[PDB]
Amino acid sequence: RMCKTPSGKFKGYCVNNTNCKNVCRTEGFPTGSCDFHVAGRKCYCYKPCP
Numbered sequence: 001r002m003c004k005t006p007s008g009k010f011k012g013y014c015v016n017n018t019n020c021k022n023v024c025r026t027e028g029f030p031t032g033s034c035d036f037h038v039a040g041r042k043c044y045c046y047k048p049c050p
Contacts, residue, residue: 001048002046002047003046003047003049004033004044004045004046005029005044005045005046005047006042006043006044007023007032007042007043007044007045009023009026009027010023010024010032010042010043014034014035014041014042014043015034015041016034017032017033017034019043020032020034020043020044020045021033023043024043024046029045029046029047030046030047030048031045031046031047032044033045
């Protein structure tokens with residue numbers, strides 16, 4: 001499973017997945033990617049769950 005987890009330290013616009021990615025990679029996630037669930041762009045971190 002791909003666990004999409006809301007980024008904690010990400011503050012800003014997740015236009016590119018790569019920024020999300022890096023922030024998630026620094027939070028403790030293999031990768032990060034952007035999502036739209038708010039008026040703007042929200043970074044989410046992806047991690048393999050079963």
